[PDB]
Amino acid sequence: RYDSRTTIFSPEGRLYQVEYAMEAIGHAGTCLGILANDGVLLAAERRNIHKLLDEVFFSEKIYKLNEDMACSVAGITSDANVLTNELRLIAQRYLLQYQEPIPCEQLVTALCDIKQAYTQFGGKRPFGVSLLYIGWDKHYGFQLYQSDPSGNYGGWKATCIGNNSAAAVSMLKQDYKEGEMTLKSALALAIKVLNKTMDVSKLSAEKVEIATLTRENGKTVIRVLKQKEVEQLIKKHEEEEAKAEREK
Amino acid sequence: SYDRAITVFSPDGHLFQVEYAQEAVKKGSTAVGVRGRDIVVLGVEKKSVAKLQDERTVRKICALDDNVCMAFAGLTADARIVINRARVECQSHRLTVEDPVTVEYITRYIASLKQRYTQSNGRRPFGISALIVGFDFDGTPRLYQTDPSGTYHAWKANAIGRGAKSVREFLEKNYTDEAIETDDLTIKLVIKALLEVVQSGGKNIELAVMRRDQSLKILNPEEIEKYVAEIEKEKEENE
Amino acid sequence: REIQRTMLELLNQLDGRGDVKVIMATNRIETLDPALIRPGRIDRKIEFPLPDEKTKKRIFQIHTSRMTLADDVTLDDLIMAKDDLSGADIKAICTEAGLMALRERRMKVTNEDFKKSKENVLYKKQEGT
Amino acid sequence: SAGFDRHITIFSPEGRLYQVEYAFKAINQGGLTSVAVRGKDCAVIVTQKKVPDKLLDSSTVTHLFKITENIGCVMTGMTADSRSQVQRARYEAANWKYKYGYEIPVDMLCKRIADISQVYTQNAEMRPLGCCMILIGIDEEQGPQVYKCDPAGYYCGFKATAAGVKQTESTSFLEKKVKKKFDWTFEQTVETAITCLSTVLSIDFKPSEIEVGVVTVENPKFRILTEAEIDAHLVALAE
Amino acid sequence: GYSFSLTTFSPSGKLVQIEYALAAVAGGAPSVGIKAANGVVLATEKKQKSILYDERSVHKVEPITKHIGLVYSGMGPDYRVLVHRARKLAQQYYLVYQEPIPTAQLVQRVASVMQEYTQSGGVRPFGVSLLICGWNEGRPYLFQSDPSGAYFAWKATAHGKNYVNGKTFLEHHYNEDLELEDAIHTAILTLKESFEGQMTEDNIEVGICNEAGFRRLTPTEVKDYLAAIA
Amino acid sequence: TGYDLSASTFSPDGRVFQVEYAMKAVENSSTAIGIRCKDGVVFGVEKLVLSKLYEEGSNKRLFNVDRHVGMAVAGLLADARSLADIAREEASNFRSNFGYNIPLKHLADRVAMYVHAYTLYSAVRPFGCSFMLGSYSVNDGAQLYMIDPSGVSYGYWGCAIGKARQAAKTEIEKLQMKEMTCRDIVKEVAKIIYIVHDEVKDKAFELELSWVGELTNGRHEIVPKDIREEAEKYAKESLK
Amino acid sequence: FEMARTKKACLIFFDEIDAIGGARFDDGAGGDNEVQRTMLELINQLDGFDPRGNIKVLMATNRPDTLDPALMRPGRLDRKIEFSLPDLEGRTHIFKIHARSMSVERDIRFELLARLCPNSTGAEIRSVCTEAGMFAIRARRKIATEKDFLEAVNKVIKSYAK
Amino acid sequence: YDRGVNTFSPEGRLFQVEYAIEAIKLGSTAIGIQTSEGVCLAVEKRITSPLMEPSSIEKIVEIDAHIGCAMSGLIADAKTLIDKARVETQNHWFTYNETMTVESVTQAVSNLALQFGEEDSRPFGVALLFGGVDEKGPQLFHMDPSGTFVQCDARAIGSASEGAQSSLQEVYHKSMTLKEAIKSSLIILKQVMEEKLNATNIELATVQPGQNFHMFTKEELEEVIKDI
Amino acid sequence: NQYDNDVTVWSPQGRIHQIEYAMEAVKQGSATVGLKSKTHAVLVALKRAQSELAAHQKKILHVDNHIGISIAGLTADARLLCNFMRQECLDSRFVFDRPLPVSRLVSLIGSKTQIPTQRYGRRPYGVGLLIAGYDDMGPHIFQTCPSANYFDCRAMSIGARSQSARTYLERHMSEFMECNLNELVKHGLRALRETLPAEQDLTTKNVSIGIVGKDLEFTIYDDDDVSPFLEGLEERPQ
């Protein structure tokens, strides 16, 4: 019964409350950053597709944290809402101090530090948010990162969190394109992964959110796709499978 | 009393809840460190990058200052927090204070920090042990073990993580009176100690060297094959 | 809380000597109270390391003695690299490989069966820090 | 069921009012009764001043508390919680005239008491004052107004109301009487209050066993009746 | 059992204490709100649980700004306290940022005020869920905010007692091309569906965000729909 | 029972048990009574003398450190010592802030405020003692109030607290407390204390008296009936 | 007691009398409650120096602090005795006793073995003597020796106290 | 029973302080001896691994030129108290412009230890011995974790504390020469620490009124290591 | 039993038994005594030994040139209270240059002893205090306990083996008041001799005394200063 409090050493030496924060993702909305180089993308599926949802958010899983960095979130909605704006506040503070855009890696580490601090102190709870990061910086350019509620982080070429992450990572191993990770090939991967990792059958594109980032015009750009173009992408997936049909 | 809380002694004087730090450290990565004839040499294993993963962000060893770094066995979030404390601490102390920073000073500071976080409720003491190696202590390099309990000590050669079990005997099995000569035998003994790692072939066995005067130098993949081959040839000729 | 009275009963049955010999065993020996593992009355402390290379050859061979091997898989790749696995993991590998060959109707076990057998089995242990 | 009510902050599985109703049961443990009525230009409060003992100075044993000369109050429940909350309302009115200056309506005063009680509820530090107030006052061209507040943070304006031991049955008698468009004159208001108490008290109305207060537009000074005046208004039912 | 704290996890990686506040919200009186081309309707059923209650004095529709309307389900005290806090936030935002607050920003910041209690064991959340409505740049807005600090955007929604019935009823009638008076008709229809017993305009209150501002409806104006409502 | 351990938790029914245990703590305490007179108040208090280690007189329970405030206490004595300072403060605070003596009702309010407030917070508990205010002022004559550690407080003609809280009522009601002078009320109080358990069980016993009125300039003096013993002999008159 | 008195007078002894002579525990509210039904039938039906028939009785336990005063008082107990870890003379004498318990090279410096033992028991002395037997067995030696005794003592002294 | 030190036992004892008393035993053996010739201290150096730096187990330490310390228990919490003892001498230097007596250092460390029950942190699992040649002569003092202190002509802490103490009571008096006190301490140490003596498992220091200097009597004490 | 916790909790009986646990913690062994006279006040506390090579522990402290105290246990709260009394006397000299009277000082100490007993986060005091003093009113003996009460006494004794001392003091309270300094200390030491164990007679090595009076500050006497007071002690008849 060593999970009864946040700050406890188990006889196994494991902190079961932080492990529970890890388990919390086991029912969160799925979001993936596909294998993308020369560009970078984040995509997600929507739980709340309903006949009366207004969707005036225009983004509820993808969140643009800076003019050239974006994030995708799975976990506690309120902790997500406060952390995604803590991101923007960190960017504003760093821009005010250094007069320079913040690097992606430093941002990831700084925010994971806050998450770790909340995991460390009693009378406090870890932020139940796991999330993926994309952006361009003077250090490396486009990057893809993953971060846990515990404050752990990792750099990735492709990753996915939330529901059905096993299938996503399996096909990422299967459809791996090491080096030739061009963004349009990542969209080709997306066309299939959106229908595959989603537990749905015959996916409707409106339950999907897609965004990307690229140095298209030199000053960096972040793009988000509407319903019609994602429907066209899913149609391209449908015709890919309808020509694989010749051997099904 | 029982292990339900840090701040109370067991009815025999034990601190089981604190003493869980041993297996807290043991389930992390694997690392080894030595001081050579002058140059300290460290090595890490157990990366196991899952294809799309990288070890670049994993950062088992980080150079705090041009004459001090450490190895971070344990949970990675606490390791990164220790990075941000120690690196900035030594940088600011050297940049502002009348005295320079030494590996002994940073080891003292980390020991005091962990002891102080043991000194209160509602504050989880850092669950990582670390080998902290420094090039400058009155100009002389040296090595330190540090533990979550706040205890710290100096070593000639040590191992942390899952490799902390066997190497304690292994070093005593082959440590010569001669401190491992130059960088040749220093790196050779690093490789010998890291041979307890999964395959010892250098496929996921990496290392770095600090020459007691210059900053941390990396045994990068374009060259670490040479040290791996040195270790393999040494183990093959003595068979 | 009868476990401690049973402990005193255990030390009574040990010492109170006779013909019956009494084996103790566990993986979690590092926790035991010296009142239980008292050297000077507890006679011997035997140890199994992780199965070494030659052990592992013998274990894979014995566990594969019943199924129809094929020369495309000399078990060496499954056996000699590292601190790989325990003997029970070896038995599980052999059983799952046999089942794997069964579902593909391959009543001649192959290298790929063992390969995906490892690929499935080795993920079934929990993480660390 | 049990356990989920040992602290005020805990919400029940159904999100029910466990500790709130515990405070109300504590109010009932203060075994007294009170009634209040509103009229065309008059409003009356009354409390069951059942003489505890002859040794108590009857003038001091009041449960009617003039908090501001235009504001009348009748209280039910815990004694010292009554004292504390009445003093808090006094301080709130004093601050209201200190900063805004203009008159504090009974509406706003009882609402402030109510959301202060809610602030009590939201924090594990503060036990809500286990007592209920009925406040009466004057507002612009609306005649007198009667409002009620209680540890739940509830806050409601009333044409009539009651509280205490006979709370349910007194309110039932009110709902039997006030449930009609009629000439609710001042004499009629005295009649309604005395009939409401007389249908629940079962003891004939001696001049010394209750406390009667009143606020009326014709004399906006809040009043508290004495024994002789109590009899001189009970004659309205002795007819 | 793990609901005794709000700052510790159940093994399921969940926080038990918050769904209890949501159950208290479900126990709250019904509220319903929809959008139409002219604006947004919010409405709530009110009861004289005792006939003693002053009917016209107390209300449940509350204006945060003259372009924002707000109704709730849940407990009254927490609701009023959070409404005062939301006003003291919204007018401050109007002052500091030199702009009447957008509805989405107001909803998000009230949700943050709600989230403030989702940590540490010394405080408890409000047991209230809010329907929020507004008019900005000629466009209507409707939102829901919840005790968890979460929020949603709905074209038509209802919560409180019989909330699923409200959902199904709105699905039975709602279209995005409604005109706001027929929107009032559907709102009073779902209000009448939600509550038991005879209903009149004094036992119902409604607030309307037109592009010409927000305002609460008068019982005189509610009588225009209380009669001839099907 | 059960929902008991904190004063900030209402019982499911009834009232706070953390306070009823202070109530029962008062039950074990030595008795103390207070009776008003025409121009002031008188208190009579009984107390043990432990054993011959005791210095024949010591650590009395009556106090007088104010111009007009007279006090008696019952219950746990140390809490009463810590509690009397609240009245000692409040009287001078009011007199300095507003230029005249505080009404005794407001004093009884604002002194018991702290006692009850220490029940509202789970961190603390109320004082385990009852106290007994008696004072005289120009605009309202002489008044007397009871305060119970639960915070229950009201005015009185005369009252009694301690291990004899109920019986002494019958002794109080036979005195014309509105008319009788404090000089004779002292003797009446002495004999009443003697009547109700003088030294029946706590045989190693001593008695102390109070005398506060305008003839004492409103101030409180611990009237020394060890000298001239007229109240002492008048109390001993009732033994047979 | 009845079957003992059917014997031609008998001596009966109880161990861990703390678990038997321990008093009532009401606040347990159940559990393994059989103790509360049985134990007084020892304590209250037990007889002492006066009310006792032709029977001799002896008690023992390592933990006396919890014992019921009824056991402590007469009618149950006629004397109480305390022990400690065997003193230096005691530890020497235990090895003197156990020199009979094996075949050894009987030139032993038991006087130094009892001092190499710090504060320690006498059951461990028996265990150490059998451990010197283990030393002979692992060496297959037909007799035990002083070195066997020394490192058998260190078996406890070092490994049980390192 | 024993969740916190806010309450005592139904006997009135704390269920914490005696826990520190046996926690004294988690460390190696340690001895302190006062003579008219000065004060000496000793601790068993028994290593975990000899390839650790052998001086890094700093259980025999100098506080200042006239004052030294020995510890029993964990080194971590001992470090704080030893640092307090060392820094108070420099505080005396910078405030009073002279040296500080071991008695007042003892008093200051006692008040620092006595904080966990009357703040508004936690008990220290270490017992300390100081030996000084201060303004009041030779002076050995002992603190247990309880925060109290006592003068001692000799004292024993750590593992095998009480046996060494009882055996030393046969061979001690208040005013012999410190050298024969060292010899009598060593003839008991040889049996108290493990089996045999050398730098891997023994350590000792001393200070004398004739030597306000170099308490670190190590590797020059070698002769009396081989005298026994 | 649940009700054995923080002084904030009352037991159902209406008691805080942890205060009684502190009081019984006070009663754990060798004797101490205090008693005063017309001329002087005296306290005595025997310095308990530890071994033949460890010093006896002093149990007597000086507060001011008219007041001192004596202490029972491991002095966790006792010595801190002594230092607070010393600072209070220093403040009295800072305000009016006067050594403040004993009783009015001890009243504030009693209030301070009561202060923790109402709130969480602070253990009750585990020591009992004896006080000997003289002032501009007279000489006094006071004593304070974990129950935060203060007592002016003709004689007092805390600890065990002291009920014989307490009875001797209860017998000779008839003399303690009128005695001089020497007679008073003789009476106290006779009460202490009443506490003698079976195998022992009083030794100088443990007896330690503190003394104050109308013409003498509070001072401390040991071994051969105690012996001029040990003379006149009760004999050993039967």
Residue numbers in the entry:
A (entry chain K): 4 to 251
B (entry chain L): 2 to 240
C (entry chain B): 303 to 318, 322 to 434
D (entry chain H): 6 to 244
E (entry chain J): 5 to 234
F (entry chain N): 5 to 244
G (entry chain A): 261 to 422
H (entry chain P): 8 to 127, 134 to 241
What sentences appear in the manuscript?
It consists of a 20S core particle (CP) capped by one or two 19S regulatory particles (RPs) that gate access to the CP proteolytic chamber.
The following PSRpt6 state also showed two ATPs and four ADPs bound to the ATPase hexamer. During the transition from PSRpt3*, two hydrolysis event occurred, in Rpt5 and Rpt4, while Rpt3 and Rpt6 exchanged ADP for ATP. Interestingly, there are visible gaps at the ADP-bound subunit interfaces Rpt5–Rpt1, Rpt1–Rpt2 and Rpt2–Rpt6. Furthermore, Rpn1 is highly mobile, likely because its anchoring Rpt1 and Rpt2 subunits are at the staircase seam and simultaneously disengaged from the substrate. Because of these higher flexibilities in PSRpt6 and the consequently lower overall resolution for Rpt subunits even in the locally refined map, the nucleotide densities are more ambiguous, yet our nucleotide assignments are reasonable assumptions on the basis of the observed densities.
